[PDB]
Short mmCIF file of C-alpha atoms and ligand atoms in Angstrom, two decimals:
data_model
loop_
_atom_site.label_atom_id
_atom_site.label_comp_id
_atom_site.label_asym_id
_atom_site.label_seq_id
_atom_site.Cartn_x
_atom_site.Cartn_y
_atom_site.Cartn_z
CA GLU J 78 0.07 0.02 -0.02
CA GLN J 79 2.83 2.41 0.90
CA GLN J 80 4.55 1.68 -2.34
CA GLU J 81 1.29 2.26 -4.24
CA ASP J 82 1.13 5.55 -2.52
CA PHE J 83 4.57 6.44 -3.49
CA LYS J 84 3.68 5.47 -7.00
CA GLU J 85 0.84 8.02 -7.22
CA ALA J 86 3.10 10.60 -5.48
CA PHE J 87 5.58 9.94 -8.26
CA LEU J 88 2.97 10.30 -10.93
CA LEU J 89 2.06 13.51 -9.40
CA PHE J 90 5.66 14.44 -9.26
CA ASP J 91 6.68 13.62 -13.03
CA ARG J 92 7.05 16.74 -15.00
CA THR J 93 5.31 15.83 -18.21
CA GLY J 94 3.50 12.57 -19.63
CA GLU J 95 6.47 12.31 -22.22
CA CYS J 96 9.00 11.31 -19.22
CA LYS J 97 8.47 7.39 -18.76
CA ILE J 98 11.60 8.21 -16.45
CA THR J 99 14.83 9.66 -16.94
CA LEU J 100 17.65 8.49 -14.66
CA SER J 101 18.23 12.29 -13.90
CA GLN J 102 14.48 12.38 -12.86
CA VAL J 103 15.04 9.01 -11.11
CA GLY J 104 17.78 10.80 -8.77
CA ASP J 105 15.23 13.79 -8.46
CA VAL J 106 12.17 11.68 -7.40
CA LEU J 107 14.62 9.84 -4.85
CA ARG J 108 15.73 13.16 -3.40
CA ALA J 109 12.25 14.80 -3.39
CA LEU J 110 10.41 11.70 -1.87
CA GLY J 111 11.14 11.19 1.55
CA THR J 112 14.42 9.65 1.09
CA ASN J 113 17.71 11.15 -0.13
CA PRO J 114 20.54 8.51 -0.60
CA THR J 115 24.04 8.97 -1.65
CA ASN J 116 24.05 8.73 -5.40
CA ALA J 117 27.23 6.10 -5.88
CA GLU J 118 25.18 3.60 -3.85
CA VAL J 119 21.96 3.64 -5.59
CA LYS J 120 23.90 3.92 -8.94
CA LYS J 121 25.83 0.77 -7.85
CA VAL J 122 22.32 -1.12 -7.41
CA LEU J 123 21.35 0.27 -10.74
CA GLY J 124 24.74 -1.09 -12.35
CA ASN J 125 26.88 1.99 -12.28
CA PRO J 126 25.95 3.70 -15.56
CA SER J 127 28.52 5.98 -17.10
CA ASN J 128 27.63 9.73 -17.10
CA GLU J 129 26.96 9.77 -20.95
CA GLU J 130 25.08 6.48 -20.41
CA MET J 131 23.00 7.93 -17.46
CA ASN J 132 22.16 11.15 -19.51
CA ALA J 133 21.32 9.47 -22.95
CA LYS J 134 19.93 6.29 -22.00
CA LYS J 135 16.41 5.71 -20.34
CA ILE J 136 15.23 3.86 -17.15
CA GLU J 137 12.04 2.23 -16.02
CA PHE J 138 10.56 3.26 -12.83
CA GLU J 139 9.09 -0.16 -11.98
CA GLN J 140 12.36 -1.92 -10.84
CA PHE J 141 13.46 1.50 -9.35
CA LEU J 142 10.63 1.24 -6.72
CA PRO J 143 11.84 -2.00 -5.27
CA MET J 144 15.49 -0.53 -5.11
CA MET J 145 14.00 2.76 -3.68
CA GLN J 146 12.38 0.73 -0.97
CA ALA J 147 15.46 -1.06 -0.04
CA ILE J 148 17.65 2.11 -0.08
CA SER J 149 14.93 3.56 2.36
CA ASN J 150 15.49 0.28 4.56
CA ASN J 151 19.15 0.88 4.52
CA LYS J 152 18.36 4.37 5.80
CA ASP J 153 21.50 6.38 5.08
CA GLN J 154 19.56 9.64 6.57
CA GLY J 155 21.39 11.56 9.02
CA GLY J 156 20.75 12.82 12.27
CA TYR J 157 20.07 16.24 13.91
CA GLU J 158 23.06 15.91 16.16
CA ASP J 159 25.02 14.44 13.22
CA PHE J 160 24.19 17.72 11.21
CA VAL J 161 25.14 20.04 14.13
CA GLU J 162 28.45 18.04 14.42
CA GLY J 163 29.05 18.39 10.71
CA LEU J 164 28.34 22.08 10.29
CA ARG J 165 29.60 23.41 13.63
CA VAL J 166 33.21 22.95 12.00
CA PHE J 167 32.31 26.12 10.09
CA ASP J 168 31.47 27.95 13.17
CA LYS J 169 34.95 29.20 13.30
CA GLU J 170 34.51 32.01 15.87
CA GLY J 171 31.89 29.72 17.96
CA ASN J 172 28.82 32.11 17.89
CA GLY J 173 26.67 29.94 16.18
CA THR J 174 27.23 31.61 12.61
CA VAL J 175 28.72 30.38 9.28
CA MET J 176 29.26 32.19 6.24
CA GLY J 177 27.28 31.72 3.22
CA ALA J 178 30.11 31.92 0.72
CA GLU J 179 31.76 29.05 2.63
CA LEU J 180 28.69 26.81 2.47
CA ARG J 181 28.06 27.39 -1.39
CA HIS J 182 31.84 26.69 -1.85
CA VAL J 183 31.80 23.46 0.15
CA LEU J 184 28.47 22.41 -1.02
CA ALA J 185 29.00 23.08 -4.72
CA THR J 186 32.65 22.08 -4.89
CA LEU J 187 33.36 19.39 -2.41
CA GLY J 188 30.75 16.85 -2.38
CA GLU J 189 28.03 15.71 -4.88
CA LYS J 190 28.38 18.90 -7.04
CA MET J 191 25.73 21.59 -7.54
CA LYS J 192 26.27 24.67 -9.89
CA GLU J 193 26.29 28.01 -8.41
CA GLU J 194 22.58 28.45 -9.65
CA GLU J 195 21.05 25.76 -7.65
CA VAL J 196 22.98 26.49 -4.55
CA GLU J 197 21.85 30.05 -4.95
CA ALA J 198 18.36 28.73 -5.17
CA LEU J 199 19.17 26.71 -1.95
CA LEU J 200 20.13 29.94 -0.06
CA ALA J 201 17.75 32.37 -1.84
CA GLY J 202 15.14 33.71 0.76
CA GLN J 203 17.21 32.77 3.78
CA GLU J 204 20.67 34.21 3.43
CA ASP J 205 21.40 36.98 5.93
CA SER J 206 21.89 40.60 4.78
CA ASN J 207 25.42 40.56 6.22
CA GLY J 208 26.12 37.36 5.04
CA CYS J 209 26.56 35.09 7.89
CA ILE J 210 23.84 32.43 8.46
CA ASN J 211 23.05 30.83 11.95
CA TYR J 212 23.54 27.13 11.65
CA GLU J 213 20.87 26.14 13.95
CA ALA J 214 18.34 27.86 11.77
CA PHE J 215 19.99 26.12 8.71
CA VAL J 216 19.90 22.76 10.06
CA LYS J 217 16.44 23.21 11.06
CA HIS J 218 15.61 24.42 7.65
CA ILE J 219 17.16 21.19 6.49
CA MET J 220 15.11 19.35 9.11
CA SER J 221 11.98 20.68 7.41
CA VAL J 222 11.96 17.71 4.96
CA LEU B 70 63.90 29.65 -9.75
CA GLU B 71 64.39 31.34 -6.31
CA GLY B 72 60.57 31.21 -6.13
CA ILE B 73 60.82 27.44 -6.52
CA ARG B 74 63.67 27.17 -3.94
CA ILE B 75 61.62 29.30 -1.46
CA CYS B 76 58.54 27.23 -1.92
CA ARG B 77 60.12 23.90 -1.80
CA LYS B 78 62.28 24.90 1.25
CA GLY B 79 59.90 27.08 2.99
CA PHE B 80 56.36 26.69 4.17
CA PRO B 81 53.82 27.99 1.81
CA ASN B 82 50.71 27.84 4.03
CA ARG B 83 49.93 28.83 7.67
CA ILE B 84 46.39 28.98 9.28
CA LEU B 85 45.50 30.67 12.69
CA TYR B 86 45.00 28.15 15.50
CA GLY B 87 41.57 29.18 16.16
CA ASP B 88 40.59 29.11 12.49
CA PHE B 89 42.19 25.72 11.68
CA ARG B 90 41.31 23.93 14.95
CA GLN B 91 37.59 24.70 14.39
CA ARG B 92 37.95 24.03 10.78
CA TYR B 93 39.81 20.68 10.54
CA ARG B 94 39.12 19.39 14.23
CA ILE B 95 36.81 17.06 11.93
CA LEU B 96 39.97 14.98 11.21
CA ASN B 97 39.66 13.56 14.88
CA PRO B 98 36.82 14.76 16.95
CA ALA B 99 38.21 12.73 20.00
CA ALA B 100 41.30 14.70 19.87
CA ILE B 101 39.16 18.02 19.93
CA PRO B 102 35.83 16.96 21.84
CA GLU B 103 33.23 19.84 21.84
CA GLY B 104 32.00 21.30 25.29
CA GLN B 105 35.06 20.43 26.90
CA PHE B 106 37.90 23.01 27.20
CA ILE B 107 40.64 22.59 24.77
CA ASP B 108 43.64 24.95 24.29
CA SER B 109 44.15 25.80 20.55
CA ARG B 110 47.71 25.45 20.56
CA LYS B 111 47.80 22.30 22.88
CA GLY B 112 44.96 20.83 20.89
CA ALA B 113 46.60 21.41 17.89
CA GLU B 114 49.87 19.65 19.20
CA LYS B 115 47.73 16.71 20.14
CA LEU B 116 45.62 16.46 16.80
CA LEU B 117 48.86 16.76 14.52
CA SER B 118 50.65 14.11 16.71
CA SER B 119 47.60 11.74 16.40
CA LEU N 128 63.80 25.24 -19.29
CA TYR N 129 63.17 21.91 -20.52
CA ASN N 130 59.69 21.67 -18.54
CA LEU N 131 58.90 24.82 -20.23
CA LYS N 132 60.15 23.72 -23.38
CA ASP N 133 58.60 20.24 -23.79
CA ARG N 134 55.40 21.85 -22.30
CA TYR N 135 55.48 24.69 -24.90
CA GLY N 136 56.66 22.36 -27.52
CA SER N 137 53.28 20.68 -27.05
CA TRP N 138 51.75 24.27 -26.57
CA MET N 139 51.24 23.54 -22.90
CA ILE N 140 52.18 27.29 -21.99
CA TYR N 141 51.53 27.36 -18.20
CA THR N 142 53.76 25.94 -15.42
CA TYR N 143 53.95 26.78 -11.87
CA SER N 144 57.22 27.67 -9.84
CA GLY N 145 55.94 26.69 -6.31
CA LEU N 146 53.13 29.04 -5.37
CA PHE N 147 52.84 30.91 -8.75
CA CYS N 148 52.74 30.81 -12.28
CA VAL N 149 55.47 31.26 -15.27
CA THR N 150 54.22 31.76 -18.58
CA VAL N 151 55.94 31.48 -21.95
CA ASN N 152 54.23 33.11 -24.70
CA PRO N 153 52.48 31.55 -27.62
CA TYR N 154 52.02 33.80 -30.68
CA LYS N 155 49.27 31.20 -31.79
CA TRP N 156 46.00 31.76 -30.25
CA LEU N 157 45.81 28.59 -28.18
CA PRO N 158 42.33 27.12 -26.86
CA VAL N 159 43.71 27.41 -23.09
CA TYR N 160 41.58 30.44 -22.71
CA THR N 161 38.14 28.88 -23.69
CA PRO N 162 35.39 30.15 -21.20
CA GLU N 163 34.52 26.46 -20.71
CA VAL N 164 38.00 26.08 -19.56
CA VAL N 165 37.59 28.54 -17.08
CA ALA N 166 34.82 26.47 -15.30
CA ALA N 167 37.03 23.59 -15.10
CA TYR N 168 39.21 25.79 -12.62
CA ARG N 169 36.20 26.52 -10.39
CA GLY N 170 37.48 25.35 -6.86
CA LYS N 171 40.17 23.19 -8.50
CA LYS N 172 42.93 23.67 -6.08
CA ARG N 173 46.53 24.00 -7.40
CA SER N 174 47.62 20.71 -6.36
CA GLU N 175 44.84 19.09 -8.45
CA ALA N 176 44.58 21.51 -11.48
CA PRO N 177 46.93 21.83 -14.46
CA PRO N 178 48.87 24.91 -14.21
CA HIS N 179 47.07 27.85 -15.83
CA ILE N 180 46.53 31.68 -14.90
CA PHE N 181 42.85 30.52 -14.10
CA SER N 182 44.21 28.45 -11.20
CA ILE N 183 45.85 31.73 -9.66
CA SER N 184 42.59 33.52 -10.07
CA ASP N 185 40.71 30.67 -8.30
CA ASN N 186 43.23 30.59 -5.56
CA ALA N 187 42.98 34.32 -4.96
CA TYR N 188 39.16 33.98 -4.46
CA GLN N 189 39.62 31.13 -2.11
CA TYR N 190 42.19 32.72 -0.09
CA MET N 191 39.84 35.79 -0.18
CA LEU N 192 36.74 33.87 1.20
CA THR N 193 39.02 31.82 3.87
CA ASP N 194 41.11 34.60 5.42
CA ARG N 195 38.71 37.43 4.81
CA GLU N 196 41.47 39.39 3.44
CA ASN N 197 42.04 41.56 0.27
CA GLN N 198 43.88 39.66 -2.45
CA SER N 199 45.83 40.60 -5.58
CA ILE N 200 47.16 38.98 -8.85
CA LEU N 201 50.29 40.75 -10.06
CA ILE N 202 51.05 39.92 -13.90
CA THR N 203 54.50 40.91 -14.81
CA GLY N 204 57.19 40.36 -17.50
CA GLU N 205 58.69 41.90 -20.69
CA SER N 206 56.64 43.64 -23.26
CA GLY N 207 54.96 41.54 -25.67
CA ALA N 208 54.48 38.61 -23.16
CA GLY N 209 50.64 38.74 -22.61
CA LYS N 210 50.28 40.72 -19.59
CA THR N 211 47.40 42.88 -21.26
CA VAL N 212 45.89 39.56 -22.47
CA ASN N 213 46.44 37.83 -19.08
CA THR N 214 44.76 40.52 -17.42
CA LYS N 215 42.01 40.33 -19.77
CA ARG N 216 41.75 36.50 -19.07
CA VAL N 217 41.86 37.10 -15.27
CA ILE N 218 39.17 39.68 -15.66
CA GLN N 219 37.50 37.07 -17.86
CA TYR N 220 37.71 34.48 -15.02
CA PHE N 221 35.75 36.86 -12.56
CA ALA N 222 33.43 37.98 -15.37
CA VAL N 223 32.41 34.33 -16.36
CA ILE N 224 32.40 33.02 -12.73
CA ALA N 225 30.01 35.64 -11.66
CA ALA N 226 28.20 35.07 -14.84
CA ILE N 227 27.05 31.59 -13.99
CA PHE V 168 -22.91 24.16 -0.86
CA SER V 169 -19.41 22.97 0.44
CA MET V 170 -18.09 24.02 -2.83
CA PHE V 171 -19.01 27.66 -2.43
CA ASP V 172 -17.39 30.45 -0.31
CA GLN V 173 -20.25 32.10 1.91
CA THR V 174 -19.17 35.48 0.37
CA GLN V 175 -20.39 34.29 -3.10
CA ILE V 176 -23.56 32.86 -1.68
CA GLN V 177 -24.35 36.16 0.01
CA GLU V 178 -23.67 38.02 -3.14
CA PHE V 179 -25.83 35.83 -5.17
CA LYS V 180 -28.48 36.60 -2.43
CA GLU V 181 -28.01 40.32 -2.87
CA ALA V 182 -28.30 39.93 -6.60
CA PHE V 183 -31.31 37.84 -6.53
CA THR V 184 -33.07 40.09 -4.03
CA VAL V 185 -32.11 43.25 -6.02
CA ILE V 186 -33.06 41.77 -9.27
CA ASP V 187 -36.87 41.19 -8.38
CA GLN V 188 -37.81 44.45 -9.38
CA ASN V 189 -41.60 44.19 -8.64
CA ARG V 190 -41.22 42.21 -5.45
CA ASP V 191 -42.27 39.21 -7.53
CA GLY V 192 -40.06 36.65 -5.89
CA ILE V 193 -39.41 35.49 -9.40
CA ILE V 194 -38.12 36.59 -12.54
CA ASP V 195 -39.95 37.44 -15.93
CA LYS V 196 -39.37 39.20 -19.23
CA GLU V 197 -40.18 42.59 -18.11
CA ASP V 198 -37.82 42.48 -15.30
CA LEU V 199 -35.20 41.72 -17.75
CA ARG V 200 -36.11 44.58 -19.96
CA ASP V 201 -35.82 47.01 -16.83
CA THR V 202 -32.53 45.33 -15.70
CA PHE V 203 -30.87 45.67 -19.22
CA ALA V 204 -32.09 49.39 -19.97
CA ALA V 205 -31.10 50.55 -16.45
CA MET V 206 -27.77 48.75 -16.18
CA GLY V 207 -26.85 48.67 -20.16
CA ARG V 208 -27.99 50.75 -22.86
CA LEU V 209 -30.41 51.28 -25.43
CA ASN V 210 -28.92 49.09 -28.03
CA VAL V 211 -30.41 46.11 -26.19
CA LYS V 212 -33.44 46.22 -28.58
CA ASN V 213 -32.42 43.05 -30.30
CA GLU V 214 -34.56 39.85 -30.20
CA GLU V 215 -31.99 38.23 -28.11
CA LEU V 216 -33.76 39.33 -24.98
CA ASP V 217 -36.58 36.92 -25.67
CA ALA V 218 -33.90 34.06 -26.13
CA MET V 219 -32.85 34.71 -22.61
CA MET V 220 -36.09 33.35 -21.14
CA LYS V 221 -35.41 30.27 -23.11
CA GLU V 222 -32.45 29.50 -20.91
CA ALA V 223 -34.54 29.01 -17.76
CA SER V 224 -38.32 29.42 -18.51
CA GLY V 225 -40.64 29.51 -15.68
CA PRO V 226 -40.07 30.74 -12.14
CA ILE V 227 -36.81 29.77 -10.42
CA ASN V 228 -35.97 30.00 -6.74
CA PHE V 229 -32.68 30.90 -4.85
CA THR V 230 -32.09 27.22 -4.44
CA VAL V 231 -32.14 26.44 -8.06
CA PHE V 232 -30.22 29.53 -8.55
CA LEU V 233 -27.34 28.46 -6.54
CA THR V 234 -27.24 24.85 -8.11
CA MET V 235 -27.62 26.27 -11.61
CA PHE V 236 -24.84 28.56 -11.01
CA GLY V 237 -22.81 26.01 -9.13
CA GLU V 238 -22.82 23.59 -12.13
CA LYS V 239 -22.10 26.46 -14.33
CA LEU V 240 -19.21 27.68 -12.00
CA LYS V 241 -17.38 24.54 -12.67
CA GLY V 242 -13.56 25.71 -13.01
CA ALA V 243 -14.21 28.69 -10.96
CA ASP V 244 -12.77 29.54 -7.80
CA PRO V 245 -12.65 32.49 -5.16
CA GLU V 246 -10.61 35.56 -6.52
CA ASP V 247 -8.44 35.87 -3.17
CA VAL V 248 -6.97 32.44 -3.91
CA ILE V 249 -6.53 33.09 -7.61
CA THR V 250 -4.59 36.27 -6.66
CA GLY V 251 -2.40 34.38 -4.38
CA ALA V 252 -2.04 31.48 -6.79
CA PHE V 253 -0.88 34.03 -9.58
CA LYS V 254 1.40 35.77 -7.38
CA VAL V 255 3.17 32.49 -6.59
CA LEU V 256 3.10 31.39 -9.98
CA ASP V 257 5.21 34.40 -11.17
CA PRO V 258 8.92 33.71 -10.46
CA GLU V 259 9.20 37.46 -9.78
CA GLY V 260 5.99 37.72 -8.06
CA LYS V 261 5.08 40.88 -9.84
CA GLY V 262 3.60 40.09 -13.28
CA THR V 263 6.51 40.55 -15.66
CA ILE V 264 6.93 37.26 -17.47
CA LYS V 265 6.46 36.85 -21.14
CA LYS V 266 3.54 35.01 -22.88
CA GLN V 267 5.62 32.66 -24.79
CA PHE V 268 6.98 31.13 -21.45
CA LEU V 269 3.61 30.63 -19.94
CA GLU V 270 1.92 29.45 -22.97
CA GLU V 271 4.57 26.95 -23.84
CA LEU V 272 4.52 25.72 -20.18
CA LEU V 273 0.96 25.52 -19.46
CA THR V 274 0.47 23.35 -22.92
CA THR V 275 3.37 21.17 -22.08
CA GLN V 276 2.94 20.25 -18.34
CA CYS V 277 -0.67 19.12 -18.22
CA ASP V 278 -4.19 19.23 -19.98
CA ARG V 279 -3.43 19.83 -23.61
CA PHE V 280 -6.32 21.92 -24.30
CA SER V 281 -6.79 24.01 -27.76
CA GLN V 282 -3.77 26.53 -27.80
CA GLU V 283 -5.90 28.92 -29.76
CA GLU V 284 -7.74 30.40 -26.92
CA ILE V 285 -4.80 31.06 -24.64
CA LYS V 286 -2.88 32.21 -27.54
CA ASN V 287 -5.40 34.77 -28.64
CA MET V 288 -5.63 36.29 -25.10
CA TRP V 289 -1.68 36.14 -24.52
CA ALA V 290 -0.92 37.41 -27.96
CA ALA V 291 -3.72 39.92 -27.81
CA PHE V 292 -0.73 42.00 -26.86
CA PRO V 293 3.00 41.73 -28.35
CA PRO V 294 4.95 39.64 -26.12
CA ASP V 295 8.28 41.26 -27.12
CA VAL V 296 7.30 44.90 -26.13
CA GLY V 297 4.30 44.09 -23.90
CA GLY V 298 4.52 40.46 -22.66
CA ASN V 299 4.36 41.43 -19.05
CA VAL V 300 1.22 39.28 -17.81
CA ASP V 301 0.29 42.03 -15.09
CA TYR V 302 -2.06 39.04 -13.49
CA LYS V 303 -4.27 41.50 -11.64
CA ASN V 304 -5.55 42.94 -15.02
CA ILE V 305 -5.99 39.23 -16.14
CA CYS V 306 -7.96 38.08 -13.25
CA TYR V 307 -10.16 41.35 -13.26
CA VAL V 308 -10.87 40.84 -17.03
CA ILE V 309 -11.99 37.50 -16.32
CA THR V 310 -14.46 38.73 -13.77
CA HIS V 311 -14.40 42.48 -12.31
CA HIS M 5 35.68 44.20 -5.37
CA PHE M 6 33.69 41.28 -4.24
CA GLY M 7 30.77 41.30 -1.59
CA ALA M 8 30.45 38.90 1.44
CA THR M 9 28.52 36.40 -0.66
CA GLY M 10 31.58 36.26 -2.82
CA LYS M 11 29.76 37.63 -6.04
CA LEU M 12 31.41 40.42 -8.15
CA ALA M 13 30.58 43.84 -6.54
CA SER M 14 32.64 46.84 -8.03
CA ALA M 15 35.94 47.65 -9.89
CA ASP M 16 38.24 50.60 -9.85
CA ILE M 17 40.77 51.47 -12.65
CA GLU M 18 43.76 53.51 -11.62
CA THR M 19 46.22 54.54 -14.50
CA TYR M 20 49.52 55.90 -13.73
CA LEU M 21 50.88 57.70 -16.87
CA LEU M 22 49.82 57.98 -20.53
CA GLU M 23 52.80 58.34 -23.07
CA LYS M 24 51.53 61.84 -23.99
CA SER M 25 54.86 62.29 -26.08
CA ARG M 26 53.68 59.77 -28.73
CA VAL M 27 50.71 61.71 -30.05
CA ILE M 28 52.86 63.97 -32.02
CA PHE M 29 55.88 61.98 -32.54
CA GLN M 30 56.80 58.48 -33.62
CA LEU M 31 60.15 56.95 -34.60
CA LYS M 32 60.46 54.74 -37.96
CA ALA M 33 58.67 51.61 -37.58
CA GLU M 34 56.48 52.47 -34.98
CA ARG M 35 52.64 53.98 -35.11
CA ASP M 36 51.04 56.73 -33.30
CA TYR M 37 48.08 55.56 -31.00
CA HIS M 38 45.69 53.23 -32.85
CA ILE M 39 42.81 55.70 -32.43
CA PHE M 40 44.55 57.89 -35.08
CA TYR M 41 44.93 55.42 -37.79
CA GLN M 42 41.78 53.37 -37.02
CA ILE M 43 39.65 56.69 -37.61
CA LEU M 44 41.68 57.63 -40.63
CA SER M 45 41.46 54.08 -42.27
CA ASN M 46 37.87 53.89 -42.04
CA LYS M 47 34.95 51.81 -42.87
CA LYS M 48 32.59 54.90 -41.66
CA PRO M 49 33.02 58.07 -44.05
CA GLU M 50 30.90 60.14 -41.19
CA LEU M 51 33.97 59.93 -38.78
CA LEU M 52 36.27 60.75 -41.72
CA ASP M 53 34.42 63.84 -42.69
CA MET M 54 33.08 65.14 -39.11
N1 ADP Z 611 49.13 33.50 -24.23
C1 ADP Z 611 48.86 34.13 -25.54
N2 ADP Z 611 47.82 33.67 -26.45
C2 ADP Z 611 47.76 34.37 -27.40
N3 ADP Z 611 48.34 35.39 -27.83
C3 ADP Z 611 49.45 35.95 -27.23
C4 ADP Z 611 49.50 35.37 -25.69
N4 ADP Z 611 50.58 36.16 -25.16
C5 ADP Z 611 50.84 37.16 -26.03
N5 ADP Z 611 50.14 37.13 -27.20
C6 ADP Z 611 50.05 38.11 -28.35
O1 ADP Z 611 51.30 38.85 -28.17
C7 ADP Z 611 50.83 40.52 -28.40
C8 ADP Z 611 51.25 41.07 -27.02
O2 ADP Z 611 50.23 40.61 -26.08
P1 ADP Z 611 49.81 41.58 -24.84
O3 ADP Z 611 48.81 40.92 -23.92
O4 ADP Z 611 49.31 42.98 -25.30
O5 ADP Z 611 51.27 41.75 -24.04
P2 ADP Z 611 51.94 43.28 -24.12
O6 ADP Z 611 51.00 43.99 -23.30
O7 ADP Z 611 53.10 42.87 -23.19
O8 ADP Z 611 52.26 43.55 -25.37
C9 ADP Z 611 49.46 40.27 -28.74
O9 ADP Z 611 49.52 40.34 -30.13
C10 ADP Z 611 48.90 38.91 -28.34
O10 ADP Z 611 47.81 38.44 -29.00
C1 XB2 Z 612 50.32 33.89 5.46
C2 XB2 Z 612 49.83 33.44 3.97
C3 XB2 Z 612 51.15 32.93 2.98
N1 XB2 Z 612 48.76 32.51 3.89
C4 XB2 Z 612 48.85 31.22 4.44
O1 XB2 Z 612 49.83 31.05 4.79
C5 XB2 Z 612 47.59 30.42 4.48
C6 XB2 Z 612 46.45 30.92 4.01
N2 XB2 Z 612 45.25 30.46 4.06
C7 XB2 Z 612 44.96 29.12 4.70
C8 XB2 Z 612 43.93 29.23 5.74
C9 XB2 Z 612 43.95 28.35 3.66
C10 XB2 Z 612 44.15 27.06 3.08
C11 XB2 Z 612 43.51 26.46 1.93
C12 XB2 Z 612 42.37 27.02 1.53
C13 XB2 Z 612 42.08 28.32 1.90
C14 XB2 Z 612 42.95 29.02 2.97
N3 XB2 Z 612 46.42 32.23 3.44
C15 XB2 Z 612 47.51 32.95 3.45
O2 XB2 Z 612 47.30 34.21 2.91
MG1 MG Z 613 -40.96 40.86 -12.43
#
């Protein structure tokens, strides 16, 4: 029943009926549904497609839903204390504030890369007027999922 | 060529103890536990020895 | 000399000399300045990236954001070496970085 | 009744009570003649006024008024939520997107209706020099 | 100049000394400043006659 609910939520997610499902959208439905696994592991269960293979060729969602469930069971989701442990490294002056340019630098460059455009959207509407974000509010914003 | 000599022989990068201890304490959080008092110089000495 | 001459012999013009760059001039317009080559320097630190002026521009933007201090990039040489064009490239760096 | 906001119900009650010009409790042809002459203009001399009775012959009460409008109201929603929805739809939140972007997206993302009605409204003005969909004007032209 | 968010903010051009002597005198094998000949060697007659 919950998989059927996820299937209809995915049908409502899909951008147009012409999308039978692109691996790009497969990653996006992963991230948008109540999961957010690291991409190398889900690509591993798929079969590690090349970047051009993942871009050009198509995928079927039917087999994706079982592995979606399996990675959901693996539950690589973090924890609030773990997030605070991670973000506190940036709190160099120890007052609960981190610099937004540092966050865009590491979040774009260091891990799963995001272009400056989507990291800007990521901070759009919440970045402080001086430029220093308060990490407890940022972690809580992440917690909003 | 002198700029090569001084870059190889010298020390190209230095970070303030507060800025780096806070930045890379992540390498070994048991060397720099949170909440507990830690000296930046002495902590840096323990971390780098670790 | 031969690090330069084998690189420039293969029209690899840029090399570092520790912390900074030495450039021997190609009178040919090489593709090392394509605006999509600038993006390959975004965040690619000096130990990872192949030598280029764009590496120095990225390094100056990184030390800026980390030390919270003003930076500079000091293009120098004889006449005819590329200081005006390298300046136009450093400016192109910041222009296209802000352009995305 | 759960479909209607009570504001529209009270407005329909106000309209029904003001339209009964002779305290009739019902609507007749003569009431339509005075309504069109007072509200509109002398150009209403066309026979079409007699065709208006064909739509709903005989007396009709406020209950049937509400049910007939409710079924006719399919696809209609309260203006306040439509104003909020338009302000959310705009990326800039202020009515400055070009028609070509909106007509392409609306036809692509769902319900491939005929293009010609949306195209005629949105191209009623040149999108290159006047493409700004100042949504307040759009919603009011639909209604107010 | 860059803002706190690291985006481009402003720029400031300071120029130290123009070679003003060149405007009236050039040795063999060297031009006057390029603006002179490019207005003379011209695709646009209006610049040439104005
Ligand atoms: N790396 C390079 N790539 C392409 N052309 C170059 C390069 N370096 C120098 N040149 C050429 O040499 C000439 C001088 O370049 P410029 O940047 O003006 O140096 P300078 O200001 O010292 O004369 C120009 O014609 C320019 O096109
Ligand atoms: C004193 C000078 C030579 N220097 C350093 O010695 C180290 C600097 N920055 C460190 C903090 C850093 C390392 C890696 C990325 C960004 C910044 N800056 C500097 O300006
Ligand atoms: Mg009457």
